[PDB]
Design a protein around this ligand. Structure first.
Ligand SMILES: CCn1cc(C(=O)NCc2ccc(F)cc2)cn1
Length: 164
């Protein structure tokens, strides 16, 4: 049963205008089977629009490609993104008053490198408010997190969203 195609796509920005379907494919095939690979071009001039997309056979292959950044394709460092509000911070709700830093860290560190964990407390009483913010060193962590249907931390079913 294949993962939805949308979750297997990488948008690739910042291409060299000399990158082609073939050279984009030869590069990104290093990290998995590509079912699709397209450079976007002007319909009249055929001049590159400077971005394209690749579709892998599996989500684990998307992960491998993102873990191999930075990608230099035909001499230029490109910008791959999954299926954009590009942020490095998430809101984590529903953690109640018994969730601590290490609960959040042990779970979220497997999505990416954590730089900040902020467990929110009441300005007047100091009591925990039941939500937190986690800041990562890179946006792909957040992108992986927010497409999951479920997040379970410290036994709690959590609501997780991009934080701006
Ligand atoms: C950057 C992450 N991301 C990109 C999309 C996307 O659909 N790309 C926009 C686009 C596609 C083709 C065009 F011709 C013009 C614009 C979705 N998420």
């Amino acid at each position: 049963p294949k993962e939805p195609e949308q979750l297997r796509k990488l948008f690739i920005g910042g291409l060299s205008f000399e990158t082609t379907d073939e050279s984009l494919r030869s590069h990104f095939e290093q990290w998995g089977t590509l079912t699709d690979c397209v450079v976007m071009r002007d319909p009249n001039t055929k001049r590159s629009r400077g971005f394209g997309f690749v579709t892998y056979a599996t989500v684990e292959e998307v992960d491998a490609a993102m873990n191999a950044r930075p990608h230099k394709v035909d001499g230029r460092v490109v910008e791959p993104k999954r299926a954009h509000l590009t942020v490095k911070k998430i809101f984590v709700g529903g953690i109640k008053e018994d969730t601590e830093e290490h609960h959040l860290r042990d779970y979220f560190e497997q999505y990416g490198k954590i730089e900040v964990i902020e467990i929110m407390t009441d300005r007047g009483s100091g009591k925990k408010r039941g939500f937190a913010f986690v800041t990562f060193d890179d946006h792909d962590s957040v992108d992986k997190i927010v497409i999951q249907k479920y997040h379970t931390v410290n036994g709690h079913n959590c609501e997780v969203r991009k934080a701006l």
